[PDB]
Design a protein around this motif. Sequence first.
Motif, PDB file in Angstrom:
ATOM      1  N   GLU A   1       0.856  -1.179   0.000  1.00 48.76           N
ATOM      2  CA  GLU A   1       0.000   0.000   0.000  1.00 48.76           C
ATOM      3  C   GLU A   1       0.881   1.214   0.000  1.00 48.76           C
ATOM      4  OE1 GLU A   1      -0.333   2.183   2.939  1.00 48.76           O
ATOM      5  OE2 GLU A   1       1.239   0.887   3.871  1.00 48.76           O
ATOM      6  N   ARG A   2       0.447   2.227  -0.737  1.00 49.98           N
ATOM      7  CA  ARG A   2       1.170   3.486  -0.856  1.00 49.98           C
ATOM      8  C   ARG A   2       2.697   3.324  -1.036  1.00 49.98           C
ATOM      9  NH1 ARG A   2      -2.813   7.235  -0.561  1.00 49.98           N
ATOM     10  NH2 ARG A   2      -4.522   7.045   0.957  1.00 49.98           N
ATOM     11  N   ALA A   3       3.075   2.570  -2.066  1.00 45.10           N
ATOM     12  CA  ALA A   3       4.466   2.314  -2.417  1.00 45.10           C
ATOM     13  C   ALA A   3       5.363   1.701  -1.329  1.00 45.10           C
ATOM     14  CB  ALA A   3       5.102   3.564  -3.016  1.00 45.10           C
ATOM     15  N   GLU A   4       4.763   0.974  -0.389  1.00 37.95           N
ATOM     16  CA  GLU A   4       5.509   0.272   0.648  1.00 37.95           C
ATOM     17  C   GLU A   4       4.979  -1.175   0.768  1.00 37.95           C
ATOM     18  OE1 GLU A   4       5.133   1.292   4.938  1.00 37.95           O
ATOM     19  OE2 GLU A   4       7.327   0.962   5.040  1.00 37.95           O
ATOM     20  N   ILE A   5       5.876  -2.134   0.963  1.00 36.16           N
ATOM     21  CA  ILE A   5       5.470  -3.521   1.099  1.00 36.16           C
ATOM     22  C   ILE A   5       5.763  -3.977   2.525  1.00 36.16           C
ATOM     23  CG2 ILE A   5       5.891  -5.952   0.344  1.00 36.16           C
ATOM     24  CD1 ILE A   5       6.493  -4.703  -2.484  1.00 36.16           C
ATOM     25  N   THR A   6       4.715  -4.422   3.213  1.00 36.06           N
ATOM     26  CA  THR A   6       4.844  -4.909   4.567  1.00 36.06           C
ATOM     27  C   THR A   6       4.728  -6.426   4.575  1.00 36.06           C
ATOM     28  OG1 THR A   6       3.841  -2.877   5.434  1.00 36.06           O
ATOM     29  CG2 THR A   6       3.936  -4.765   6.922  1.00 36.06           C
ATOM     30  N   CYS A   7       5.679  -7.068   5.247  1.00 33.11           N
ATOM     31  CA  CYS A   7       5.698  -8.524   5.399  1.00 33.11           C
ATOM     32  C   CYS A   7       5.703  -8.936   6.866  1.00 33.11           C
ATOM     33  CB  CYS A   7       6.933  -9.129   4.707  1.00 33.11           C
ATOM     34  SG  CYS A   7       7.017  -8.863   2.888  1.00 33.11           S
ATOM     35  N   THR A   8       4.742  -9.761   7.248  1.00 29.58           N
ATOM     36  CA  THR A   8       4.659 -10.301   8.611  1.00 29.58           C
ATOM     37  C   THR A   8       5.142 -11.744   8.443  1.00 29.58           C
ATOM     38  OG1 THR A   8       2.711  -8.918   9.044  1.00 29.58           O
ATOM     39  CG2 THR A   8       3.132 -10.709  10.612  1.00 29.58           C
ATOM     40  N   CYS A   9       6.243 -12.079   9.096  1.00 30.76           N
ATOM     41  CA  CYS A   9       6.804 -13.396   8.920  1.00 30.76           C
ATOM     42  C   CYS A   9       6.780 -14.175  10.219  1.00 30.76           C
ATOM     43  CB  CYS A   9       8.250 -13.242   8.403  1.00 30.76           C
ATOM     44  SG  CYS A   9       8.464 -11.828   7.215  1.00 30.76           S
ATOM     45  N   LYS A  10       7.671 -15.154  10.310  1.00 30.08           N
ATOM     46  CA  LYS A  10       7.719 -16.019  11.482  1.00 30.08           C
ATOM     47  C   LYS A  10       9.170 -16.246  11.912  1.00 30.08           C
ATOM     48  CE  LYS A  10       8.070 -20.885  10.980  1.00 30.08           C
ATOM     49  NZ  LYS A  10       7.698 -22.078  10.216  1.00 30.08           N
TER      50      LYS A  10
ATOM     51  N   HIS B   1      15.102  -2.100   2.814  1.00 30.58           N
ATOM     52  CA  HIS B   1      14.119  -2.582   3.781  1.00 30.58           C
ATOM     53  C   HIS B   1      14.611  -2.394   5.215  1.00 30.58           C
ATOM     54  CE1 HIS B   1      17.014  -5.831   4.106  1.00 30.58           C
ATOM     55  NE2 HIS B   1      16.361  -6.246   5.186  1.00 30.58           N
ATOM     56  N   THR B   2      13.723  -2.682   6.159  1.00 27.18           N
ATOM     57  CA  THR B   2      14.042  -2.646   7.574  1.00 27.18           C
ATOM     58  C   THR B   2      13.336  -3.844   8.155  1.00 27.18           C
ATOM     59  OG1 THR B   2      12.055  -1.306   8.125  1.00 27.18           O
ATOM     60  CG2 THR B   2      14.123  -0.153   7.694  1.00 27.18           C
ATOM     61  N   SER B   3      13.649  -4.169   9.397  1.00 26.47           N
ATOM     62  CA  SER B   3      13.002  -5.272  10.088  1.00 26.47           C
ATOM     63  C   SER B   3      12.944  -4.990  11.593  1.00 26.47           C
ATOM     64  CB  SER B   3      13.688  -6.619   9.817  1.00 26.47           C
ATOM     65  OG  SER B   3      14.813  -6.837  10.646  1.00 26.47           O
ATOM     66  N   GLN B   4      11.894  -5.518  12.224  1.00 22.80           N
ATOM     67  CA  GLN B   4      11.661  -5.413  13.665  1.00 22.80           C
ATOM     68  C   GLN B   4      10.624  -6.490  13.973  1.00 22.80           C
ATOM     69  OE1 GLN B   4       9.092  -1.479  13.730  1.00 22.80           O
ATOM     70  NE2 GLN B   4       8.546  -2.704  15.594  1.00 22.80           N
ATOM     71  N   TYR B   5      10.046  -6.435  15.174  1.00 17.78           N
ATOM     72  CA  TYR B   5       8.979  -7.354  15.578  1.00 17.78           C
ATOM     73  C   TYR B   5       7.743  -6.517  15.909  1.00 17.78           C
ATOM     74  CZ  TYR B   5      12.367 -11.179  16.295  1.00 17.78           C
ATOM     75  OH  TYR B   5      13.350 -12.131  16.097  1.00 17.78           O
ATOM     76  N   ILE B   6       6.582  -7.164  15.857  1.00 16.36           N
ATOM     77  CA  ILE B   6       5.338  -6.520  16.258  1.00 16.36           C
ATOM     78  C   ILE B   6       5.508  -6.329  17.789  1.00 16.36           C
ATOM     79  CG2 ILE B   6       2.812  -6.821  16.561  1.00 16.36           C
ATOM     80  CD1 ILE B   6       2.758  -8.484  14.066  1.00 16.36           C
ATOM     81  N   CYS B   7       5.512  -5.077  18.233  1.00 19.32           N
ATOM     82  CA  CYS B   7       5.667  -4.702  19.644  1.00 19.32           C
ATOM     83  C   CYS B   7       4.593  -5.273  20.583  1.00 19.32           C
ATOM     84  CB  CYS B   7       5.630  -3.168  19.782  1.00 19.32           C
ATOM     85  SG  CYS B   7       6.992  -2.193  19.098  1.00 19.32           S
TER      86      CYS B   7
ATOM     87  N   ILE C   1       9.475  -3.145   3.164  1.00 15.93           N
ATOM     88  CA  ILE C   1      10.272  -2.961   1.967  1.00 15.93           C
ATOM     89  C   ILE C   1       9.869  -1.758   1.140  1.00 15.93           C
ATOM     90  CG2 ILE C   1      11.049  -4.133  -0.158  1.00 15.93           C
ATOM     91  CD1 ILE C   1      10.374  -6.815   1.195  1.00 15.93           C
ATOM     92  N   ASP C   2      10.879  -1.033   0.693  1.00 15.35           N
ATOM     93  CA  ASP C   2      10.673   0.108  -0.193  1.00 15.35           C
ATOM     94  C   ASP C   2      11.041  -0.470  -1.569  1.00 15.35           C
ATOM     95  OD1 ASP C   2      11.014   2.299  -1.987  1.00 15.35           O
ATOM     96  OD2 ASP C   2      11.840   3.562  -0.418  1.00 15.35           O
ATOM     97  N   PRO C   3      10.044  -0.724  -2.422  1.00  3.92           N
ATOM     98  CA  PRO C   3      10.372  -1.391  -3.681  1.00  3.92           C
ATOM     99  C   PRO C   3      11.016  -0.449  -4.733  1.00  3.92           C
ATOM    100  CG  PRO C   3       8.046  -0.907  -3.611  1.00  3.92           C
ATOM    101  CD  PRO C   3       8.582  -0.560  -2.254  1.00  3.92           C
TER     102      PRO C   3
END
Lengths: 388, 388, 388, 388
Positions: free
Chosen positions: A203-212, A232-238, A225-227
């Motif tokens: 959405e709005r030129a950004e890609i969000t990935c929720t992984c494991k 990209h950057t990474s963190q955890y759901i707070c 991710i900025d395509p």
Amino acid sequence: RDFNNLTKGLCTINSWHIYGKDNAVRIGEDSDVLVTREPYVSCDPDECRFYALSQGTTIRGKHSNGTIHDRSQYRALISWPLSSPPTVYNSRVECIGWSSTSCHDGKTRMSICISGPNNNASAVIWYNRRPVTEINTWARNILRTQESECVCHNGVCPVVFTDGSATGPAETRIYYFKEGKILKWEPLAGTAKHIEECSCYGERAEITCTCKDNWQGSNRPVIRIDPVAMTHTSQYICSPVLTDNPRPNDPTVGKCNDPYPGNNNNGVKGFSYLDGVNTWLGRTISIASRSGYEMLKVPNALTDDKSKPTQGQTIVLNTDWSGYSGSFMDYWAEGECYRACFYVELIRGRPKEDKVWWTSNSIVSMCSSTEFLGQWDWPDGAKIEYFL
Amino acid sequence: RDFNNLTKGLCTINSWHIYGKDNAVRIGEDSDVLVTREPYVSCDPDECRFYALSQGTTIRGKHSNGTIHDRSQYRALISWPLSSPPTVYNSRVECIGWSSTSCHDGKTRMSICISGPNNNASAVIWYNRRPVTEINTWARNILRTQESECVCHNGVCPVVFTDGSATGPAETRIYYFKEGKILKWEPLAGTAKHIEECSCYGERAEITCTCKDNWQGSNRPVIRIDPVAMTHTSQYICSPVLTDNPRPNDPTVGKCNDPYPGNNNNGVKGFSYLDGVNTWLGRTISIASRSGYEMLKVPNALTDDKSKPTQGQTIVLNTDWSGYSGSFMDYWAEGECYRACFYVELIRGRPKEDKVWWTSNSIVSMCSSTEFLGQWDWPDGAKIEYFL
Amino acid sequence: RDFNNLTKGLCTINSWHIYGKDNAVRIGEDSDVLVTREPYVSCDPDECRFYALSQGTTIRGKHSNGTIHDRSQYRALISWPLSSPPTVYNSRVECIGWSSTSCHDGKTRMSICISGPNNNASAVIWYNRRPVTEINTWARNILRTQESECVCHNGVCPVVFTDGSATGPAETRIYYFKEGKILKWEPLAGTAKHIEECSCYGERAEITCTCKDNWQGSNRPVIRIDPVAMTHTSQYICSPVLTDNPRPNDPTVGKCNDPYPGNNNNGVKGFSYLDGVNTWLGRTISIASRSGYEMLKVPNALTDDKSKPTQGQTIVLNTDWSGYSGSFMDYWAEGECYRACFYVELIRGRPKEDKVWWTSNSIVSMCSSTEFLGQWDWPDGAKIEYFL
Amino acid sequence: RDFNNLTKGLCTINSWHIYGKDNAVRIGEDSDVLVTREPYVSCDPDECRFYALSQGTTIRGKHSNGTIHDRSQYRALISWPLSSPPTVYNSRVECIGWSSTSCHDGKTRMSICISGPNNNASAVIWYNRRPVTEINTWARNILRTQESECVCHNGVCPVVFTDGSATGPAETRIYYFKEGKILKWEPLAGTAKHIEECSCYGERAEITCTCKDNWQGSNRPVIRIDPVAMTHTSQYICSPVLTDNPRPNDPTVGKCNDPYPGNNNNGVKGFSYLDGVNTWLGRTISIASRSGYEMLKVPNALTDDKSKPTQGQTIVLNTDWSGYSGSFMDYWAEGECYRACFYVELIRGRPKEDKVWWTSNSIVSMCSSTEFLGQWDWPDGAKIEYFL
Ligand SMILES: *[C@@H]1O[C@H](CO)[C@@H](O[C@@H]2O[C@H](CO)[C@@H](O[C@@H]3O[C@H](CO[C@H]4O[C@H](CO)[C@@H](O)[C@H](O)[C@@H]4O)[C@@H](O)[C@H](O[C@H]4O[C@H](CO)[C@@H](O)[C@H](O)[C@@H]4O[C@H]4O[C@H](CO)[C@@H](O)[C@H](O)[C@@H]4O[C@H]4O[C@H](CO)[C@@H](O)[C@H](O)[C@@H]4O)[C@@H]3O)[C@H](O)[C@H]2NC(C)=O)[C@H](O)[C@H]1NC(C)=O
Ligand SMILES: *[C@@H]1O[C@H](CO)[C@@H](O[C@@H]2O[C@H](CO)[C@@H](O[C@@H]3O[C@H](CO[C@H]4O[C@H](CO)[C@@H](O)[C@H](O)[C@@H]4O)[C@@H](O)[C@H](O[C@H]4O[C@H](CO)[C@@H](O)[C@H](O)[C@@H]4O[C@H]4O[C@H](CO)[C@@H](O)[C@H](O)[C@@H]4O[C@H]4O[C@H](CO)[C@@H](O)[C@H](O)[C@@H]4O)[C@@H]3O)[C@H](O)[C@H]2NC(C)=O)[C@H](O)[C@H]1NC(C)=O
Ligand SMILES: *[C@@H]1O[C@H](CO)[C@@H](O[C@@H]2O[C@H](CO)[C@@H](O[C@@H]3O[C@H](CO[C@H]4O[C@H](CO)[C@@H](O)[C@H](O)[C@@H]4O)[C@@H](O)[C@H](O[C@H]4O[C@H](CO)[C@@H](O)[C@H](O)[C@@H]4O[C@H]4O[C@H](CO)[C@@H](O)[C@H](O)[C@@H]4O[C@H]4O[C@H](CO)[C@@H](O)[C@H](O)[C@@H]4O)[C@@H]3O)[C@H](O)[C@H]2NC(C)=O)[C@H](O)[C@H]1NC(C)=O
Ligand SMILES: *[C@@H]1O[C@H](CO)[C@@H](O[C@@H]2O[C@H](CO)[C@@H](O[C@@H]3O[C@H](CO[C@H]4O[C@H](CO)[C@@H](O)[C@H](O)[C@@H]4O)[C@@H](O)[C@H](O[C@H]4O[C@H](CO)[C@@H](O)[C@H](O)[C@@H]4O[C@H]4O[C@H](CO)[C@@H](O)[C@H](O)[C@@H]4O[C@H]4O[C@H](CO)[C@@H](O)[C@H](O)[C@@H]4O)[C@@H]3O)[C@H](O)[C@H]2NC(C)=O)[C@H](O)[C@H]1NC(C)=O
Ligand SMILES: *[C@@H]1O[C@H](CO)[C@@H](O[C@@H]2O[C@H](CO)[C@@H](O)[C@H](O)[C@H]2NC(C)=O)[C@H](O)[C@H]1NC(C)=O
Ligand SMILES: *[C@@H]1O[C@H](CO)[C@@H](O[C@@H]2O[C@H](CO)[C@@H](O)[C@H](O)[C@H]2NC(C)=O)[C@H](O)[C@H]1NC(C)=O
Ligand SMILES: CC(=O)N[C@H]1[C@H]([C@H](O)[C@H](O)CO)OC(C(=O)O)=C[C@@H]1O
Ligand SMILES: CC(=O)N[C@H]1[C@H]([C@H](O)[C@H](O)CO)OC(C(=O)O)=C[C@@H]1O
Ligand SMILES: CC(=O)N[C@H]1[C@H]([C@H](O)[C@H](O)CO)OC(C(=O)O)=C[C@@H]1O
Ligand SMILES: CC(=O)N[C@H]1[C@H]([C@H](O)[C@H](O)CO)OC(C(=O)O)=C[C@@H]1O
Ligand SMILES: *[C@@H]1O[C@H](CO)[C@@H](O)[C@H](O)[C@H]1NC(C)=O
Ligand SMILES: [Ca+2]
Ligand SMILES: [Ca+2]
Ligand SMILES: [Ca+2]
Ligand SMILES: [Ca+2]
Ligand SMILES: [Ca+2]
């Protein structure tokens, strides 16, 4: 026509409505339905289809014996019409392998399948239904990918892969493909300590990935991710509302940059929509097994380490089997916003139902509604006793 | 291309010719045919197809046990090629749910499916095969709709819904959709006291719906809709030739603005073509059960409370099972008039044939002829004993 | 595009090459193949397909019991891809009925199906897959038609129908349709005394039909139609090489204007290509039953009452079952001439093979070659014992 | 559009990646899969499909008994979607016969099937799905062809046929077709002493065919065709790395112009890519039976009589059954070079597995990669015991 661009933001999620359900196991009791697992949904500009990893045998077939195993030479990524079951006669093979991803860039579709022995796997990237690029394993330990759709922006379709240990640090890479060719790849950066099976949306030129985080985290790692910049950057759901499985009981405060401890070397593919107050998390109801499924509205889950639910919707009762879940959206729909969607893999058979010798699943999927709709539960529906 | 407009009047109905028949139950005895009920027919500009509510299992499948029930999470609106049976391999899912309607507006098709528990159902309106609008239950008592095709005029496609009691006053609404979006909705007005399962057709910019008064009427309620003004009226077919089922014996004078009494809390979906002297009524032959089917020419049935038949045609013998019936027309045919058509649901299994544990049906459909054609009867054709 | 015109003459027939074979009975022993009979082949500008009258049940299905009967409410004209078998999943219903014909006029296809009780049958003429015209029985005794393709010229597609006795004079009519509408019809004229099941083909603006005289003739009646003038003539094939079945032994002189006697009230649908010296006749090998099949080059058979064979080709051995045969050609092929083609219905089951309770068939078809090709025999191939 | 021209050279083959696998025998244990043999792959400008010679029966069908035989009236060339199995419902018949070839010229496809008794066979050449040309047997001893795709250049598609003895000198002919018509044919010239089942590919306006010398050679005969001049040459692969089966053990020096002796009257269809140092040979691992399969990089194999392997890749373990193998490439792919591909027929049943009465196969296929990918083995995967 032209490459699709993620120009819209997400529609406001006030509830979830039923989108698709194939009742594959029920129907497959008496028709030629292929055994599958690791399913997902993905749209083309003119059609949306179900996808999954076939086991190369029907459910009633004698070769269904042993399908609890994840990687064999008889698996393949297949797609079929929305809400139909994956049958021998209507399933279209996208590629051969035991781990996959696929996405349409607006002009044509890219599908990726990984195959091989554990120490010598390779991915082959198909574009416009032809093989274009191949990537050999870099860590010689089960090269693997998303198990749900990738997302494209102006022709660039990022995909997350992991090669190496499932119970210790591994080598995760983000590849940026365009027309099936590699433009660039990066090593994982940020604070996510282990990544596997990313569920993404754009959405709005950004890609969000929720992984494991299979190794240590009961909270989910998130890669943004900025395509365009291809960074990209990474963190955890707070949030303290933990969403992996198995997991410990919910605390009152979560972790933003480290795995939330309590459960090691295990997990399930999952997803979320992180959009400020318009944030919804999916998770199994049980903290012990792939049982039940619910959607929880947790405003600012990504950044608020004390965020708790403000609304919710049960998808599958805790008395029914669930499994993997992931995100997809129809980027070619009408309107001013992208309607968040997800699917839940309803696993039947082994290991939970061991009276049968096979393992398969059916699919249920929902999309968001701006209305506050009444809820129903959506189980697989099959009676194992019938298969005995 | 352009939205279709109801510019023609009905062709003169001098008899009925065979249009389609799928022999689903016969064929399904030894092939992968899905269990269904509540079928209908609907045309696109380039093709006409059979529609029905699948039960998410084949007839021979063990999961066919229990299909007498109307609402489950395993039902879905499916369509398939004209006169073929609804098979696992050729059925296209339009949407998920246990009550539906569908119609093509000339450019694309709108399909509506309702799902949920009895007290928390919701309808989702699909257009061009994508979900666009959702409507939550307003009376918390089995939100339900037509079970046959809707009709469009210049993009406006009215649909009748009912929510609330089946044995007392309920809340019926007429929604006017355009491209799957709600332009307006009205509460039911007029003298119809209870409305359910409307069968509609359009001619000369007017949409006529013959529905069912489950609560008290053995005569049928009729809703006439002006799709431009987006207004309507309601009354009952005046004729003493009663057309619901079960029903009392025909009187010599009917009722124009009240249900004709004698039978409460029951009925069957039915239809009629009300066009002055070119008026034809369909009904079961039996006054007690869904047995047999005939077409009766009853000039001015809508407005003449003493109107009786002047011609007739048997469709199904009273020694054969029938069921629901409804209207549809190919609005994209050549010629100067619209050819009236209808289908009859041929129910097999429970509750009438309880030696089997399932309930399904096959379809037979006819269209009008300006000729005075010889008649044949059209039974389902299957032998229940074979399924034992 | 534009209506096809019969502008070419026939290619020189020096032998017959294999064109299509579906092996339906063999395959149907273990797959969902519909029971059929009265098959044929017909081409569209872009595809050629097999056609037949389904019995509304699979061969292995319990409802196959009784399929020896010709007319029921469960029959329908179906078409399917060339050389595939007629399966539940790939068969497209053209119309409902127990006697049919079909042909493409260059723009679209016309299909005709007759249904009804013996004394009240009616034909419905479909064009562009929609019903357009209906014709009620005129003699109240099994209205019936070709059972093979009709032929069109500049939009005009003549079709031969017969209504009345099969064992005495009947009322045969030639209808000239254009876009499914009746332009004109004539009563049969000429010297043919009884007509049924005409096999037709067209060349150089003339349509030749080889039919069957069920009442008295062992030689075949022939109707030649001028599709522009919309007129015709009739006579019998003069040749002593008799081609109906059953039949007496070949004499040395035939009959040009009367049925050749010896066998009454029986026969089989057959065909021929009458083109001077380029004349070929098809017939069963046995004079007693539908056994074997051969093509015989009989120069000037139509007009020479002493004409005998100058060349031949066996299609099916006398030790194998045959059945109906008819003509068709691909009028949309490349080249300067029309390549004569035909099919032979290979009947299996009742009445000849009564250990099974069904009657069905498979199809074999050939087209001509200007080469003098080696010959093979083409049996159905199924083992009845397997079905026991 | 326009006829395809072989303007590109081969891509550098550094390894082989998985392209397609249908797992037909596994799936066919419980679904309607046709019995086949002699399979191959061939591309159209918009799709690549699997091809094979059906036996006109399903594997589970009782008629599967006896399918070890090569030529019957129930065989036909069929094609189906890439990696799907050949089912009764998805298989498209290209033509009738027991030996075939097929190739797309860029505008449309040409398919050739040979049928007949051993002493009276004939080939019929189809183009744009219509029969165009027929060729009668010239040596009256099993007219036969490639069993894999032919190759076209500017509309000219050469095909190699053989008629006569399999254990002595025969009459091999190279036909040059254009739009299904014969432009010219030549007798085999060069030093190849016996030719059968040529596997061909094209690059830079030259067509290379690796065939089989059934009579005496354990090395493979090679025919190189100039499709513009419509001329050719023939020799044997010089290399001591012998590739037919059965065969003697590899020597240190091969033969360039004579069959390498040691094994008479037997062999298996095979292939190779002869491109200087970019040369790869396929062969069974076993020297005694159709067991296992490997690819060996043998620089200059065609011209170097002492050439030995410099790299290799196992495709099928010697503990698994293999069979025929052949070449194909997607000439309509993107990029600057043609990606070499091949398939291996995985034969199951008779004669090696005689507990079942049938003989069938599944397909596995690979294409080259410029990467040095890890290898996996690709067996059929079915358990014969399940079929007992
Ligand atoms: C017709 O349809 C409508 C529409 O669906 C129905 O209305 C819906 O009803 C739902 C059920 O009540 C409701 O869902 C819940 O919403 C709660 C949030 O709303 C409430 O709080 C807010 C915030 O203060 C208020 O504004 C609001 O007014 C409400 O008061 C959620 O909190 C609920 O989720 C929690 O409960 C369920 C069990 O019901 C758990 O499964 C879930 O996981 C949540 O609780 C766990 O997690 C939290 C957070 O960490 C813990 O604090 C808590 O102790 C639980 O933790 C245990 O369990 C988890 C999971 O197993 C485990 O991991 C952990 O370790 C612990 O063991 C729930 O989502 C809808 O919002 C509501 N929708 C609307 C529009 O109204 C209506 O009822 C239907 N009608 C009929 C007649 O049926
Ligand atoms: C070949 O094909 C042709 C074409 O189809 C065949 O010809 C057709 O033949 C049909 C059967 O005769 C015929 O159908 C009937 O038409 C009657 C109307 O025509 C007559 O009256 C008019 C008006 O005066 C005259 O002009 C005309 O010339 C005729 O005389 C209808 O009245 C018939 O329907 C009634 O009878 C049937 C039983 O046959 C009932 O099922 C039906 O419901 C009607 O009767 C019930 O309802 C009325 C009205 O309330 C009651 O008054 C009556 O008592 C019955 O009520 C009981 O039954 C109902 C139903 O169960 C129940 O609800 C109630 O409570 C009571 O218990 C019938 O429709 C076609 O019109 C005719 N077509 C043509 C073009 O000619 C030809 O026969 C065939 N040939 C062969 C050789 O077979
Ligand atoms: C490889 O392939 C090639 C190509 O197919 C093979 O060559 C073909 O071989 C065929 C078989 O020999 C041959 O077919 C026959 O042709 C005869 C005509 O040719 C001969 O006569 C002409 C005219 O004088 C000569 O020019 C020519 O050189 C020949 O000498 C036909 O007459 C044959 O048909 C008759 O015989 C068959 C039995 O073989 C009957 O089934 C058939 O019905 C014909 O005979 C009946 O009918 C006639 C006419 O009324 C009667 O006179 C006769 O007594 C028979 O009547 C009885 O039987 C019928 C049918 O049951 C019944 O109704 C009646 O009452 C009586 O009881 C036959 O058609 C091909 O032409 C020939 N093709 C070519 C290009 O050469 C080659 O052999 C193959 N190679 C191998 C190694 O196998
Ligand atoms: C992960 O994946 C990678 C990528 O696949 C794996 O690496 C691959 O490993 C393969 C197996 O080692 C290897 O394949 C072999 O390559 C050899 C060539 O390379 C070597 O020699 C060259 C030239 O000097 C060197 O440059 C190079 O560095 C190597 O040293 C081939 O020679 C091998 O083929 C021979 O052996 C196999 C058995 O392994 C036979 O089946 C085969 O037929 C060859 O041997 C027969 O034929 C020759 C020639 O006539 C005879 O001389 C020999 O005696 C054998 O003859 C008998 O057997 C045949 C067949 O049955 C019979 O007909 C005859 O009569 C005799 O009875 C082999 O092809 C890949 O090249 C290599 N790839 C890469 C990129 O590195 C890696 O291992 C994987 N990782 C893990 C952890 O598994
Ligand atoms: C149905 O009626 C509407 C007019 O109400 C037609 O609509 C016009 O169509 C033309 C051609 O597309 C446009 O220029 C007009 O603006 C359209 N709409 C309106 C609302 O004015 C429509 O074409 C008619 N349908 C058919 C099949 O003729
Ligand atoms: C078959 O013949 C008719 C002439 O009788 C052709 O019809 C003409 O077609 C052209 C092109 O459409 C028109 O301009 C003429 O008016 C057409 N009809 C008549 C009745 O004059 C038709 O095109 C021919 N078919 C083909 C395939 O060429
Ligand atoms: C490539 C692969 O094997 N993926 C498997 C995955 C993996 O084992 C885990 O992510 C640890 O790495 O686990 C599961 C699972 O249902 O738990 C299914 C996948 O098939
Ligand atoms: C939404 C729903 O349940 N519709 C059911 C309908 C309904 O019960 C009745 O109209 C009273 O409301 O009854 C019947 C029926 O065969 O009689 C079938 C429908 O499945
Ligand atoms: C309309 C119809 O019944 N046609 C039947 C036809 C007819 O009985 C005969 O032509 C005398 O009229 O006979 C046969 C037959 O195999 O012999 C099959 C047809 O199904
Ligand atoms: C036309 C034909 O019969 N080809 C057969 C071929 C042939 O017998 C051999 O090439 C000697 O000529 O052998 C084989 C085989 O598996 O070995 C299969 C083919 O079906
Ligand atoms: C078929 O039907 C006949 C006549 O009803 C019956 O006698 C016979 O037994 C049946 N055979 C089978 C196998 O059903
Ligand atoms: Ca975890
Ligand atoms: Ca089956
Ligand atoms: Ca009622
Ligand atoms: Ca006769
Ligand atoms: Ca050899």
